Design a protein around this ligand. Structure first.
Ligand SMILES: Nc1ncnc2c1ncn2[C@@H]1O[C@H](COP(=O)(O)OP(=O)(O)OC[C@H]2O[C@@H](O)[C@H](O)[C@@H]2O)[C@@H](O)[C@H]1O
Lengths: 82, 413, 81
């Protein structure tokens, strides 16, 4: 198994990067000694007026409807060209 | 609004028949708020070539052309299988994009004009419209286009709005969507079809001589009519284009009137009679054959022999991907067959067809038809085609031009 | 073949030459004969006519009839409407 595991792939580290990206993306900036200082602000903001309306804005996006059709038509053209 | 000084001081219109100065010109915009507007001018069926020329290249700010192509087909009776339609639009995109072409049609939202405009919108989304906008110029009758109430105005209407109706289309027709220019024509009548033909052919000849005095030699830009299938009007516009010597009509090998000429074009001119064409009209126009007058049959059966009289302007092709045959092959063959039998002795048969055969990847036709063994060449003639083949990554034309007489010592001198 | 040669020369003008022979040519795997003899280039088609043969070819795992009926005029937007 060890030889099969070590000789399996070179893309393991690249896959790991993505595992790091999510949790260290979402977490607030200030370190865990002072994380309660961020919790006070983010907890006070949470119940008064809705904060961070896009929870994830660099991963998941909702395209405008006028753009969507022009976007899909381009990749259908590229599919036939492929 | 600087064009408005000229466009109410040169171009007239027709009424009552007497003529008067025109109105109702501007820029139409369709339903999408941001879909790019066009430019419409009515010109009532009889105008000077100089005034139309000044409208064409000066007051619309429109650059010189490289290849004019014209598409004629059936409207309101046009049926084609999905396979042939798909192959035709895929070929027509590549024809219309590799060269800086102009494409011309009778733009109304009915049939073959719809199938041209949808391929043009598919490419302009596929291109992203960065620069070099494709010009798809349309010519339609003023009288038979409908719901012009929001369009007729005596002072100009630049953000002119227009909506597609698609309901009241019994004796009138709806205007198309995917064009950019519009020349509407008016004969003083409000119901008759088929007025546009004469100014369409005269506009083809007018565009054909635009590239003269611009460069070193007097070579005119090529024109090509591509006919798919259509009824009594399409045969009329084919004949009216072929009266002019330069246009070359290229026919699809699948349709109804295209199958008529595809079956007539085998026999000699003496063989064809009025019984044979009557037999073929019963055979191909299965429905609506009855509605035809015998006198109208007598008119077609003279039109068809006048089309068959000149055999070096008539070419039937058949699209098949197995035998490596497409629309560009047909355009290039029908363009080479015309020039070889002409008044000129030489030096113009090859000059503008070589760069067009290099821009497309059609090496096989090029070698036999242009590099005939009875020809003689010099490297200083073949330098620009060598540069054009070498930049755009076509190694086979490099291999062929290298051994037909391009010296590298002369080329990089 | 002997069933298609009879019906084409008959008293009726049309609309019965193909209706019961198409489903029988789809139940058997005989695509090659079907295309030339029934899908003549001088014919015209509509997807609402070819829906039941499309269903019968699609259930019984015949991909070639799917490929042929798809390009002779069956629209998927009309079929799964
Ligand atoms: N320019 C037109 N636009 C829309 N509909 C038309 C047009 N011309 C004719 N029609 C309608 O279509 C019917 C005939 O259709 P076809 O015979 O298939 O087309 P055809 O008459 O040959 O006209 C072909 C059209 O294309 C252009 O090349 C040319 O400007 C001509 O008008 C007629 O009943 C007529 O009402």
């Amino acid at each position: 198994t060890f030889q099969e595991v070590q000789d399996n792939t070179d893309t393991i580290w690249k896959f790991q990067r993505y595992e790091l990206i999510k949790e260290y993306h979402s977490r607030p900036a200030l370190p865990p000694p002072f994380i309660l200082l961020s919790h006070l602000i983010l907890f006070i903001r949470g119940v008064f007026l809705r904060d961070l309306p896009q929870r994830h804005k660099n991963f998941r996006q909702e395209l405008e409807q006028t753009e969507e059709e022009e976007l899909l038509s381009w990749e259908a053209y590229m599919k036939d060209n492929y | 609004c600087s064009l408005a000084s000229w466009i109410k001081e040169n171009i007239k219109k027709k009424e009552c028949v007497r003529e008067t100065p025109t109105d109702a010109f501007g820029d139409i915009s369709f339903g999408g708020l941001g879909q790019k507007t066009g430019k419409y001018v009515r010109v009532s069926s009889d105008t000077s070539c100089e005034n139309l020329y000044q409208l064409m290249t000066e007051q619309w700010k429109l650059r010189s052309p490289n290849l004019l192509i014209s598409v004629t087909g059936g409207a309101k009776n046009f049926y084609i299988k999905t396979h042939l339609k798909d192959k035709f639009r895929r070929g027509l995109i590549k024809v219309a994009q590799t060269t800086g072409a102009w494409i011309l049609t009778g733009g109304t939202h009915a049939g073959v004009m719809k199938h041209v405009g949808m391929a043009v919108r598919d490419y302009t989304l596929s291109s992203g419209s960065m620069e070099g906008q494709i010009v798809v110029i349309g010519v339609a009758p003023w009288g038979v286009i409908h719901n012009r109430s929001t369009l007729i105005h005596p002072e100009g209407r630049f953000p002119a709005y227009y909506s597609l109706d698609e309901q009241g289309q019994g004796r009138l027709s709806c205007l198309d969507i995917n064009h950019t220019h519009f020349l509407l024509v008016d004969d003083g009548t409000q119901g008759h079809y088929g007025v546009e033909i004469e100014l369409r052919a005269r506009l083809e000849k007018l565009i054909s001589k635009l590239s003269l005095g611009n460069r070193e030699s007097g070579v005119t830009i090529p024109v090509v009519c591509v006919v798919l299938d259509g009824g009594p009007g399409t045969l009329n516009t084919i004949y009216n284009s072929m009266l002019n010597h330069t246009p070359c009509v290229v026919l699809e090998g699948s349709g109804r009137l295209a199958d008529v000429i595809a079956h007539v074009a085998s026999v000699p001119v003496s063989k064809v009679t009025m019984a044979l064409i009557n037999r073929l009209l019963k055979r191909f126009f299965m429905q609506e054959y009855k509605n035809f007058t015998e006198l109208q049959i007598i008119e077609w059966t003279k039109k068809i022999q006048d089309i068959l009289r000149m055999p070096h302007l008539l070419t039937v092709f058949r699209i098949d991907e197995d035998k490596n045959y497409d629309v560009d092959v047909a355009i290039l063959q029908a363009l080479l067959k015309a020039s070889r039998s002409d008044e000129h002795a030489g030096r113009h048969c090859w000059e503008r067809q070589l760069e067009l055969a290099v821009a497309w990847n059609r090496v096989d036709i090029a070698e036999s038809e242009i590099f005939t063994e009875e020809s003689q060449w010099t490297s200083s003639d073949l330098h620009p085609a060598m540069f054009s083949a070498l930049v755009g990554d076509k190694p086979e034309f490099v291999r062929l031009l290298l051994e037909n007489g391009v010296c590298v010592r002369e080329f990089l001198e």
